[PDB]
Amino acid sequence: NAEEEPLFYTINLIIPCVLITSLAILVFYLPSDCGEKMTLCISVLLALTVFLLLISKIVPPTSSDSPSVGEYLMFTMVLVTFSIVTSVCVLNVHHRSPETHTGGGGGIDRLFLWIFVFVCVFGTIGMFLQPLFQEE
């Protein structure tokens, strides 16, 4: 007889997770001023750091053999880096180049927008598929 007691944590962790992503999409959709982009990256960063401390005291990855907090940490790490790449790519401009890529017509932005929500739908659902159903 389980009432998703322990699952209440992981579930409450996905709520904000998916929300954070949208935040990055809302900004990219509303390109206004520069302070919005600067505060955005700094904001998303705080969310991650805050999460660390959370589990830090609640059974951290450095106090077990097969921790779960570390799992999401890995996938999140590689994801965070990807964001930094785009952040800088926009900050600085590239005046002409020696070579020319193949394809693309100014949709590079829209590409990262979908490529993100996609990898997220799989990841979020991946851990959400743990339970047999909503009525465990």
From Swiss-Prot:
Cell membrane found in the keyword field: yes
A biological process from GO: calcium ion transport
Keywords: Cell membrane, Disease variant, Disulfide bond, Epilepsy, Glycoprotein, Ion channel, Ion transport, Ligand-gated ion channel, Membrane, Receptor, Signal, Synapse, Transmembrane, Transmembrane helix, Transport
Record-annotated membrane-spanning stretches: 11-32, 38-54, 69-93, 109-128
Keyword Signal: yes
A GO cellular component entry from the record: acetylcholine-gated channel complex
Glycosylated sites: E135
Cytoplasmic side: 33-37
Subcellular location: Synaptic cell membrane; Cell membrane
GO MF annotation: an example: acetylcholine binding
Reported impact of K57E: Increases Ca(2+) permeability
Record topological domains on the Extracellular side: 55-68
Family (UniProt): Belongs to the ligand-gated ion channel (TC 1.A.9) family. Acetylcholine receptor (TC 1.A.9.1) subfamily. Beta-2/CHRNB2 sub-subfamily.
Subunit structure: Neuronal AChR is a heteropentamer composed of two different types of subunits: alpha and beta. CHRNB2/Beta-2 subunit can be combined to CHRNA2/alpha-2, CHRNA3/alpha-3 or CHRNA4/alpha-4, CHRNA5/alpha-5, CHRNA6/alpha-6 and CHRNB3/beta-3 to give rise to functional receptors. CHRNA2:CHRNB2 and CHRNA4:CHRNB2 nAChR complexes exist in two subtypes: LS (low agonist sensitivity) with a (CHRNA2/4)3:(CHRNB2)2 and HS (high agonist sensitivity) with a (CHRNA2/4)2:(CHRNB2)3 stoichiometry; the subtypes differ in their subunit binding interfaces which are involved in ligand binding.
Primary role: Component of neuronal acetylcholine receptors (nAChRs) that function as pentameric, ligand-gated cation channels with high calcium permeability among other activities. nAChRs are excitatory neurotrasnmitter receptors formed by a collection of nAChR subunits known to mediate synaptic transmission in the nervous system and the neuromuscular junction. Each nAchR subunit confers differential attributes to channel properties, including activation, deactivation and desensitization kinetics, pH sensitivity, cation permeability, and binding to allosteric modulators.
Disease: Epilepsy, nocturnal frontal lobe, 3: An autosomal dominant focal epilepsy characterized by nocturnal seizures with hyperkinetic automatisms and poorly organized stereotyped movements.
Protein name in the entry: Neuronal acetylcholine receptor subunit beta-2
Lineage: Eukaryota, Metazoa, Chordata, Craniata, Vertebrata
Coverage span on the entire protein: 231 to 486 of 502
